[PDB]
Symmetry: C3
Subunit: 627 residues, 3 copies
Amino acid sequence: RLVQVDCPLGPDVLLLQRMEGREELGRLFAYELHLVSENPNLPLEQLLGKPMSLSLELPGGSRRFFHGIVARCSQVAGHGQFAGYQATLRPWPWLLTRTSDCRIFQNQSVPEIIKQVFRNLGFSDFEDALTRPYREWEYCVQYRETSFDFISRLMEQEGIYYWFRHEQKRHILVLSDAYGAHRSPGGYASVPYYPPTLGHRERDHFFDWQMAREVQPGSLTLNDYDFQRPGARLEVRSNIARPHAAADYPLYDYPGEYVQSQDGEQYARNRIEAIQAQHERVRLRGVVRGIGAGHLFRLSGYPRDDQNREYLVVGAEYRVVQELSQFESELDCIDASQSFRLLPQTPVPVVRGPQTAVVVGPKGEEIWTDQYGRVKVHFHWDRHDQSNENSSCWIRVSQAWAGKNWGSMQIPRIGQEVIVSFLEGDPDRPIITGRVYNAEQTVPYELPANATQSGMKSRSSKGGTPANFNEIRMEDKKGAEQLYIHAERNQDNLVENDASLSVGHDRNKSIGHDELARIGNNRTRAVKLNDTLLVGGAKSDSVTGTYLIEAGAQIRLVCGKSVVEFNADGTINISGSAFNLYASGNGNIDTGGRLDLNSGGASEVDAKGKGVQGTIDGQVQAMFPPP
Amino acid sequence: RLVQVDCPLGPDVLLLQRMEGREELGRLFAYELHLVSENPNLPLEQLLGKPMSLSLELPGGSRRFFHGIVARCSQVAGHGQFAGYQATLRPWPWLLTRTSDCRIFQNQSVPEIIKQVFRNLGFSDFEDALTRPYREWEYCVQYRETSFDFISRLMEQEGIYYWFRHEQKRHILVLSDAYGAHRSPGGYASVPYYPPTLGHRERDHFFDWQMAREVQPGSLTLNDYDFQRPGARLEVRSNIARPHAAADYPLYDYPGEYVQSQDGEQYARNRIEAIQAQHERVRLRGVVRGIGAGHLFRLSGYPRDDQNREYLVVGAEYRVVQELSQFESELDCIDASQSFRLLPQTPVPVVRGPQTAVVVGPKGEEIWTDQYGRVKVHFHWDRHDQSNENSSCWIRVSQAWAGKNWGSMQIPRIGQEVIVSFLEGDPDRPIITGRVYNAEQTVPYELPANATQSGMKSRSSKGGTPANFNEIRMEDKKGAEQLYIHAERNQDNLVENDASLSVGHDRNKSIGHDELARIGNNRTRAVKLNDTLLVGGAKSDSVTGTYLIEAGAQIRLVCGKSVVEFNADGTINISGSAFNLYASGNGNIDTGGRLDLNSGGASEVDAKGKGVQGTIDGQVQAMFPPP
Amino acid sequence: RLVQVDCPLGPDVLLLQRMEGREELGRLFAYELHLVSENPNLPLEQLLGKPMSLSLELPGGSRRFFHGIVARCSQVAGHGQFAGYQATLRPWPWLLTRTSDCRIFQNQSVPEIIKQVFRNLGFSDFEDALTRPYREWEYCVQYRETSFDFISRLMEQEGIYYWFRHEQKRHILVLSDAYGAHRSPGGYASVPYYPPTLGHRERDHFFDWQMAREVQPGSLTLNDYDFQRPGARLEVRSNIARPHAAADYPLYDYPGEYVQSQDGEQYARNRIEAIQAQHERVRLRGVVRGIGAGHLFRLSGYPRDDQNREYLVVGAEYRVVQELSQFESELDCIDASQSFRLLPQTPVPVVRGPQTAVVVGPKGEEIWTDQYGRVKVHFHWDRHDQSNENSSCWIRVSQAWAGKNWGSMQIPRIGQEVIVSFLEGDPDRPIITGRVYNAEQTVPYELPANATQSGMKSRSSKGGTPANFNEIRMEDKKGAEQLYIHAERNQDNLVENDASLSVGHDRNKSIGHDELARIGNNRTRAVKLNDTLLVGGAKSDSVTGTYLIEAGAQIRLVCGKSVVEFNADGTINISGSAFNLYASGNGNIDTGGRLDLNSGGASEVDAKGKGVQGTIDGQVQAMFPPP
């Protein structure tokens, strides 16, 4: 008979003067309510945000309900006979546009993610009628977007759409990815067409009709890149053919958000089907009260036999007026044999540039990586994690030089700050592109005092202190240049062929304990001037062959009171306290001049203070002073 | 009586056939004029771009002026007696959309910056009626945007809004941030409401009314990151409560562009109040003449008690029709107790990627940094500076590896070219992410000739030349590999524990001056074959203990004419010019065979060319040839 | 008389009930057809996507053709005798919106590029009427955009625009850049104006007329940066003056995408002329059937003398009404003396973040660069190249540190993966900003096992194996620290002034072949304890001066059976098998006590196992074990 209102503040209190609105798959509905009352001050705030329910009486005594909430309301001028109120009726997912956040999801399918969101925000009136399996997303990020947009975006991408089901007292969001999740309203399995020139038919029926066709792209090719399998062919392609001319235009995109060719196939398919869903659209007008968006119906009685087929309502317009009554609707539908998909109309969030982040990992670790050198980080905007190994997925890190098991590598450690870039601005594809210092992670050299210094200084792990490091430092200060190398422990310089060391001026070497040198073949040393050797212990030279000691002026052998002097002019002096010259065989003592014995011609040789144990020791000790 | 005109080319020349237009807080007004005149060729260009005043005669003999600039004009069809002319009036800030530029502002508050813009372009008709304190911006950039847009988004961000004051001969932009900067028109302190059912009512009044309410977000949380205080909690939150349900939806954003929590608080508050300003708005229609955007008035006589309150005119529409006189206005108002703020409508400029820049500093410096290793640069687009130390703010510089007071460091120098990235595309957040070479800053090695070389080569400063550098160079050329290390001055290799040097083939060492080595404990050297030593000066060995010299075949002591030969078979030859064997005590000479004196059995020993000073000298000089 | 239709299915089948059309320079034409037919179900797919043309009865029996392609079609309600059908006609370039791709163009002018696109997609119905010379683009990229958008964008940038020429059987795309490429329709060289107050003139004529003038910017300054000439002044400026007030507002942009100042001039000029093309627009209404977009005509008979001038039809609107014949045309025109240019309305594609790519070059190379260190890469999305040296243009590569002929040097090699950034997101300005390891390009050390290792490992080229590399490795493992250096061939350490080596504990040195050392001046060595020397060959000392050998306790000379012992207490023992003491001159043998001969006082001195050839040999070879 009419439309009855069932709402807060009383049902009969508000009479529906008229209603106008729209339904559509994958979208939020909207209805304009023009309501009138007797109460001139009917509290708008007691309706705003509240559940509403329209009761349309249908044939057979059944009823169609329109449940939702008052997104917007208004009080308007009216008449002494009535108070005027208006309301914008919207579905509860609309409230997800009133809230926003940033958030990382890990190891979840999109269906699960959506459910997660609804649960997080206290919603329960929804139902999963999905039939297709979905890939598990390792890393998916909500970023600078509303919760609604996030959801919508995911659904358009994954090829999931939704429609609503109404119960007098609640509003249900049904998820679907198949025609099988759709239903025909009771008594509206098929709706007849009655050529409007015949006059208005009392039975619910159609009277207007239009079919539109448009040239769409015939093929979509996607691509991506998996660094774990670099040479793999990830190119995928989906094709849909149409009978008309010029139906073979290709599309190509990159990246397609997949690592498996199977996933790529699905995504390509979803997108090209969404496009192809626009190839043919059918518009009908009638007074049909039971059919809305998401419903299935079969057209009958239309002259052109071809059009008497089952359709899926993808959208609808409504117009209701009441007097104190008419009901008009317009349907927008497609051939039910077509695979309905949503068009990518929801904006995609883009990271507009680099962000800083902190490297994180397990509480007992210092360094945390894997076989690819990837690391995990904590983004400053992530207010929901615990700054640990569950913060984010593994992230590849740019190095100074990469190559086939060679190049440079300087793995970042926990607590260090890094610059994160995103491939094509996509929040789901982070990569490390630089290391930075901050007030905690300070620079290795005091600045600007040491601004002329550069280099690399490492740090022992685990438990290293400021004194535990290896470094290579370069000092460019004019007139005080330095190349400094420090090894915390051992140092090993291996040269496979020839090595060379050249020092323009002074070279010092100091070794705390033992030195061992071994020369493969020959060794030649030359000193242009003096060569001093001080030995605090004992010295032992052992030559397998000939040991030639040649001097150009004088050879001296001194040992306490034993003194031997060999002069270049042939003078040989030998002094001691006693001597024992012995031959097991014959001995000759010949002179060219006179041989004298006990004559007084020979005497002690002045050792000049040499060969004195105490003095010698002092000289050695002077080379090794205490610290 | 009517609306009069005061403009270039006359006042009574053009007659206002009709006017329609709009006013709005924080926005530019627009008035559409339909003007007519007896002069069929009234030069459009002599009106275009010029000041123009309209004058609405008001009650009490006062006048409402509309002063603006003919942004656009047109010659249209008209009558015989009066030809048609059209004009669009816009406020002088509109002209700031006709100009664009890239600029950097430093150490200035937004109020100051905006005023600076107006001064730069010759504008003076504005007034500062701001009251709250504002943050001083260290660095703020105008980039690829119009001057208008620049100041527009600054005002949105800071919660600054404006309205205009009209004087017969000029147009004033008044800056505002509180209701205290707003005024009620003379005689329009309060405006009565009368029912539209009365048809015509002569006194200025309202007759239409509508109040709209909409569900808005309830809370806003902002965040940011200050590298100078990394662990600080910059998270801030602002909350505004409404009496209706579903008023508790949170928003979250990042970065909020602040470093103090106080500042963040105020930015959050501004944003959420802007949103809340849309929660409730009132639409009024009436014939008031003096009330426009930015004016205050109190509604009176409206049946519903709580509608009779003070209002702020947010926006307004006007309609004027004059027969050759009707007047109508519609107002968009809010409750004057609410804090009016502008919505973020103005597009924000985003740097779409990296840019190159040159490192700059003081004329007498080559390196210019601070305690965090930051540097200053000159952007290529900044054509309004002197490439000096004031060209930009300090910029964080990425490094190869950054840790806690350790890591790698290579500070940019003046004149070097770098790659600058912007955090989240924000022009106000530059960061250096790479160093590059150019035609002036040439590469270390000639390419592609030395493309197989890699490494690091420094440069002495200040005042260094190409010959003053330290380097570590690697040559990968197959079959000619090289590891080259060079120190401009001093080199210091320090190993805490064990060091090792292994050379597969030959090793050469050359030292220009002195060499000194000290072995803390023991030293052993082995040479598989020959060991030659040349000493240009004197050699001095001093062993505290035993000095054992072994030979496997022969020991020779040669010194000019003195020759001593010790053979492994026991033969001891001692030849000299003379000798002096002496004991201070007893001396024994014993033979197993005969002891023959002056027998002729002994003779000179062949020195074999050894022991000759000149020869020895020559050999040393051979080892040390001239340069 | 009427409009005839030349179409598929038969020209006598469709009846054009009415038509609405839109034409415009640089844009796609659109015509709305409303037509009917005796066939109640005339196959829409047999018209969709096909060629079709209208034929408007012109004076002299000539015809105006409207050739185009049915972009869209629809079947609607109609008459009973004639069913209703609708169709939208569009230009064949419209089909380029149905396809997309990514693609690199190199060394081609824009005219050439556009033609290449048409050829690639099988189109030939176009003409080149360009009069201006164009710049050859080194590198130009189609990216994530439709083919139409790509060429549209290029034309806006270059100041190229187009219009269509209709032939009975085809739709011609004419490229143009000067008024000389435009034409006046036969009999429509000049079109007369008659006042609308005359009701109607039978001859084709104009009757409505408007002129609009608007304030536009007066000057444009562009800028860019050429790294090959860093100090160049690429700043350019173009100025256009208008006679009205305030015609002097400057614009500034960066980058202008040019390297020559001459080219910059052209681009600046194009942009400002496009802006200035909107300064003055003229609106005309008439029944002129022969004039369309791109045509030239002179206005005649307009009362204002100044308007009787030549015009260029920038755009047009059409209305056709038939009956079972009305015609109306509205034109947008500009003064033909103005330089028409298109306004930047086509969305410019932008890279939203970094991408990865592979370094490529010639088949026989490992390294491929130039004098600036630039490289060639292969982008993953460029499915049309051959992964060789022609895959892209030269790209500058970021380095760790870049200075004036000094700094770091690490050149990417063929097959390595790098991170590519785009300056300002412009696809035509790539730059390498990182280097990344992948499943083929593996990390230098096994991870996470060696996560505590860092450093640089190089690789010999060409043809180097895993064992052919130079490296510097640092090990931070706590308690196992190591600094490892490895030279595959030669190593050369050159210190200009002083060098120092300090080792806290032991130092080992092993050299495979010969060692040679030369000390410029003095050398001092000290050993706190023992000093052992083992020589497998012969040892030879050549001291020019004094060779002083001191011992604090004992000197021993041992060789085979010859033994000499010098004790600190003055005891000198000399033992051999035989001896030959000889003086060329005099000899003295003196004692203080007794001088005994053959008394038995002296005896053989123990060698204590020293001086044995076999033993010595064993000791030497023990230091040099096999292999």
